[PDB]
Amino acid sequence: RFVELGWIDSTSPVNEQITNPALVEQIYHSNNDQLLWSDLATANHFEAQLEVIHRASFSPLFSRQLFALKSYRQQDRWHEYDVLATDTLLQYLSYAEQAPKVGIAWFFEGQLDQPLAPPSEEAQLALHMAIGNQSLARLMDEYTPQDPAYQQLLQAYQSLSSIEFNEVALYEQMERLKRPGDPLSHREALVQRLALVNLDTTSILNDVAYYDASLEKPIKQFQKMHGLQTDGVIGPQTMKWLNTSVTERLALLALNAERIRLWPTQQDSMIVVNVPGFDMKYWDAGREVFESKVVVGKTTRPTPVMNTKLDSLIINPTWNVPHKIMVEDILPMVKRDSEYLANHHMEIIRGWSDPEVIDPALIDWEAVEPETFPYRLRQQAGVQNALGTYKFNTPNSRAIYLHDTPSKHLFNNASRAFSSGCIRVENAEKFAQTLLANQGITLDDFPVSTQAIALKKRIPVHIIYQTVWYEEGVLHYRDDIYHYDALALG
């Protein structure tokens, strides 16, 4: 009924499957009712690009279209294929344009289940042109992030895609742990599985019945690759990653490539925190000037994906204990431990406006119900302050900022989801120094007390969620700390 095309019949399912009949009609008329997709290499390139979106499991919309396309192809229904491909490429183009704007909706909040708006005029133009110059492939590639980050993940996806269904024995072992020097049953499976992730297995010795030196370094860099303690020990966490299928790895790659559409371009001066990587990097004038491990929010108080700017830096910050924390977390502990306040250098304050220190002794602690308790808590400046020596002020509606910690031992863990959402920074001192250097700010000597310092040039802070990324020659994988890789894996 609905698609007014001469060479498509009325009862074809394409009439219901198509999103923008109007715009498809126009394109086909402008090209004298000719097929855009009769070149195989071109259809295959576009089916490949939709497999990616399929595996990433974030768009039932594109999955529907791909199944339908793949179904028209198996039956040699090349007229129906042609028109549905054209409609689906319009969607791909809306998708390419909209993700950086509003893609947070599809990858974190909800999903791309409903047809997108048509693409911009600029895009419809580029398409018309591509149709005439027989360069649809170039058009699709042009509408992928021109980011080496993207292309490195796609390169790896393409390699692994080539060997998806090569069966490879599951790596097994007798005991839950297995240390250098122990007997080793399944050496073949283990080495095959180190190879899957393109670790160099060439120097590993053959048919040695034990976990020898030749295996230590490959195992330790497989561990590093997966952000695990490089202890050399084949335990459950190692085996989880060793024994992941190529299907599972391609899904991780797919999701993480598509996620790079969200991440806001790249700036010369910029700060990136990768949550599941529990790390962060400060670029300034094209240069990586600083990197550091961080602690991010716990699963229950997660660090959200967001973009803000670093406005100012506080040296020797006092910590104004927010209400929610005082009421639930702190007052009930001072109600029992009558030494809490003094140990944590935490003084009682009339109000944030009226900063009068009240001695804890002037208070009927039996009498206090935390919910209604009328004064406020303020931790004095110091090394043992919850914010340590440095607060990094990133003002935003969610009250998330970067700060030093006194609990520097927590950086020793592989998995660093301990905070109430804020981001604790190892080597805050160096971070402070490089910021001030690159702002053209000097300090005649280190301040006695609390010092606010506004940045001349505010830096964008991007907090991303990236479970796969390319860095110094190699592809890193990380556990799905906050469960957003959920659908990709099954």
Can you read off the two tokens belonging to residue 259? 């996620």
HSE, CB side, 13 Å, CA atoms: give it for residue 351: 2
Q: How far apart are CA 458 and CA 239, in angstroms?
A: 44
* 152 or 385: CB nearest ligand MXR: 385
Nearest distance in Å: CB 429, ligand MXR: 17
Site string for ligand MXR, 380-399 (x = CB under 6 A): ------x------------x
Which amino acid is present at 238?
T
HSE, CB side, 13 Å, CA atoms: give it for residue 317: 24
Which amino acid is present at 154?
L
DSSP 412: G
Which alpha helices (DSSP H) does 134-273 contain, by range? 136-142, 148-161, 187-196, 213-225, 236-242, 246-259
Among 20, 292, 419, 467, binds ligand MXR (CB under 6 A): 419
* 245 or 407: CB nearest ligand MXR: 407
Nearest distance in Å: CB 77, ligand MXR: 56
Nearest distance in Å: CB 121, ligand MXR: 44
Q: Does 230 bind ligand MXR (CB under 6 A)?
A: no
Q: Does 421 bind ligand MXR (CB under 6 A)?
A: yes
Site string for ligand MXR, 332-371 (x = CB under 6 A): ----------------------------------------
Site string for ligand MXR, 299-328 (x = CB under 6 A): -----------------------x--x---
* 322 or 447: CB nearest ligand MXR: 322
Nearest distance in Å: CB 64, ligand MXR: 41
* 93 or 330: CB nearest ligand MXR: 330
Can you read off the two tokens belonging to residue 319? 């910590």
DSSP track, 389-411 = TEEEE---TT---EE--S-GGGG
* 101 or 301: CB nearest ligand MXR: 301
- Residues in the interface with ligand MXR (CB under 6 A) total 11
| CA neighbor of 85 nearest in space, from 56, 124, 44, 55 | 44
Can you read off the two tokens belonging to residue 44? 């295959």
* 325 or 363: CB nearest ligand MXR: 325
Nearest distance in Å: CB 383, ligand MXR: 15
| Percentage helix, strand, coil for the chain under 3-state DSSP, each rounded to 5 | 40, 15, 45
Packing angle of the helix pair 40-55, 246-259 (nearest 10 deg): 90
**Interacting residue ranges for ligand MXR, rule: CB under 6 A:** 322, 325, 329-330, 386, 399, 419-422, 424
